[PDB]
């Protein structure tokens, strides 16, 4: 698993700090050179993710491709890697193995289209859940640059991607070698002789089909790669959880609620207690921006590594050791996580 992006979150400094109380907002007008800096910093961090995602998908585009059968391309079965088809491919975009990968990952639906209305009706006590707690705490989760439909097309084209023969130097010719014949060249190069009983075709495809078909079992927390998939989701949720939990810190005041402060204190001293909540919730937001900047750069430096393995051992066979899996490397496939 290679992480290429983080969840894009933006914050409203005048809603997180003062929860719609006009008594609090008037004291925040003295501030507001510290709110713009938070708003402008988050806009830039989210802007840089868009440029990192655009760059990633231009380094993994394919110049030309050839067409593959639904399964049993030669004797090798690639069905797990292809979108289901009854007649021709209906009912979605993501391959069969993306269905199994996503179903085993616990992700809260961010509801990019009708999130406000769904949280408005349902969730009687689930209206502080990290996704429904964003119209309360004043932050927002931005949608990703590309829809899952186009993100699926970039990885689909990689499956049928064509390259220059296999013994020709350079990256400027494309040979339409069938997938079955391509695999035999990859096995031939690594030391297997071409007299190995017609290269034992019935007994290499079967072992290829067995190992490729048995990868569904690997979607458990016992697996290292899938464990990292869940940790990436957990980290995104934990950033929102800490954003909401800082609105319950008193910061030395009588309460974390401005309603209580305005109801138990006199006018002169209320302004003293509210300001402790404004001096906090702004330092905390300064820590959020600092945290999410480092996560935004870390993902962007891992998107470069994501593009590398697409070019080193997806678009061509890799002669490197350990870089692209244990054992001698034959072929690799990439899907969306």
């Amino acid at each position: 698993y290679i992480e290429t992006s983080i969840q894009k979150v933006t914050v409203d400094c005048k809603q997180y700090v003062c929860n719609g109380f006009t008594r609090c907002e008037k004291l925040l007008v003295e501030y507001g050179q510290f709110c713009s800096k938070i708003n402008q910093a988050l806009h830039g961090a989210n802007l840089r993710q868009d440029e990192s995602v655009y760059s990633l998908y231009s380094n993994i585009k394919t110049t030309s491709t050839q067409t593959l059968e639904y399964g049993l391309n030669g004797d090798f079965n690639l069905t797990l890697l292809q979108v289901p088809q009854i007649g021709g491919s209906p009912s979605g975009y993501r391959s069969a193995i993306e269905d199994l990968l996503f179903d085993k990952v616990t992700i809260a639906d961010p509801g990019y289209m009708q999130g406000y209305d769904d949280c408005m009706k349902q969730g009687p006590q689930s209206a502080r859940d990290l996704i429904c707690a964003q119209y309360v705490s004043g932050y927002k989760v931005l949608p990703p640059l590309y829809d899952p439909n186009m993100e699926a097309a970039y990885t689909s084209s990689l499956l049928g991607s064509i390259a220059g023969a296999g013994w020709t130097a350079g990256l400027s010719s494309f040979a339409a070698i069938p997938f079955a014949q391509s695999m035999f060249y990859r096995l031939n190069g690594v030391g297997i002789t071409q007299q190995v009983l017609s290269e034992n075709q019935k007994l290499i495809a079967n072992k290829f089909n067995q190992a490729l078909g048995a990868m569904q079992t690997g979607f458990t927390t016992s697996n290292q790669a899938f464990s990292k998939v869940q940790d990436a989701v957990n980290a995104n949720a934990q950033a929102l959880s800490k954003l909401a939990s800082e609105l319950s810190n008193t910061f030395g005041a009588i309460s974390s609620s401005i309603s209580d402060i305005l109801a138990r204190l006199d006018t002169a001293e209320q302004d003293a207690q509210i300001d402790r909540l404004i001096n906090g919730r702004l330092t905390s937001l300064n820590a959020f921006v600092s945290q999410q900047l480092v996560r935004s750069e870390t993902a962007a430096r891992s998107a470069q590594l994501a593009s590398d393995k697409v070019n080193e051992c997806v678009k061509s066979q890799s002669k490197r050791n350990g870089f692209c899996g244990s054992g001698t490397h034959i072929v690799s496939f990439v899907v969306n996580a």
Binding site: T10, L47, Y112, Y116, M120, P124, P144, F174, S259
Partner: protein
Amino acid sequence: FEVDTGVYSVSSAIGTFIEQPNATECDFSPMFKGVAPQVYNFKRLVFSNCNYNLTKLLSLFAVDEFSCNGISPDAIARGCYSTLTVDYFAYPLSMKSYIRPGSAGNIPLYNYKQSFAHPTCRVLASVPPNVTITKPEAYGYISKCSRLTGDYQHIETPLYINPGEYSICRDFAPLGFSEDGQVFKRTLTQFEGGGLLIGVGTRVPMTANLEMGFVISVQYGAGTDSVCPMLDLGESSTITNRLGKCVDYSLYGVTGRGVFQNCTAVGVKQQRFVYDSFDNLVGYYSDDGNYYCVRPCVSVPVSVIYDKSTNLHATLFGSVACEHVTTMNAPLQTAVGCVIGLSNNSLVVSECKLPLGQSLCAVPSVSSQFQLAVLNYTSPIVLTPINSSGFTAAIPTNFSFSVTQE
């Protein structure tokens, strides 16, 4: 006055809801009948589920000091609370410093120690001559309270009270000391520890008018009933017409802001307040026999799509359906929310400056209008495998040089 081109995340009269019970008047009569008690023999009144009239209390006393910690007298005067605890006694004004927190005298040691667990107010006041509270004889206070022990009765252990409690030397003279420095001796029983209890009392000359001390404490969340000032019922008593509206609520001693919806009952009906794991009200058993869900007040998000070159702007209501926008150009529902200011001409683009997210785009078509557009995936060259004994191949016939800058 000049902002770059991009999508920018920019930033109604909350009402009131009050359900308070129909409750009987709080009775202060026990305070006004009998000789006023001494500082070490103070008397406590607990008020719950009742109403008080502030005008009577203002008329009957003349306040001299009101040192408050955690609350203010105005808050107690305009708010409703679960429990009200009053500790009253007779205390000379001339010793008003000896009852302060931090005092080094004998009042906090043997007579009365104030507790600061809850919001409190210490009020030293004087009773007008017309008000009928029988004045004591001269004031009194305990100056020593210790347990004598040892075979020769030679070691003495001072005894100190706890915040809000009574002294153990109270029983020597509950109504007062006949002479200054009056000394008392008692023998403790075996179960009480044993030994010689020794007490000393100090007599302070009586003043011209009665002067008294009060400690007023408020408790929140200590019942399903409220102590309230007398007030009009008004029109904010009901919520059935105002579901879906953000209101400041004051319900039986708990105050806040929220929106009330109608759900199925959960929790215990007796307790009347359902809380989540973080001590926030989430349910309320109203007196009308309905259980209302309490949600925090929410705000619709707004973003601005701006093009500097053409000076065009549109508004994105992220993740909000257009039906809500109309009820609270023409709004258009997209895959990222409701958009006002974009037109759907079924435009398709290959690459564009403004991304809206989820493969949407806003492109300012020349000749002055934003148009909503959808990014289209450019399919690579599908090289046809013509039938033959070899593999069909693509070989360049013309080339160029491109410099990539990093």
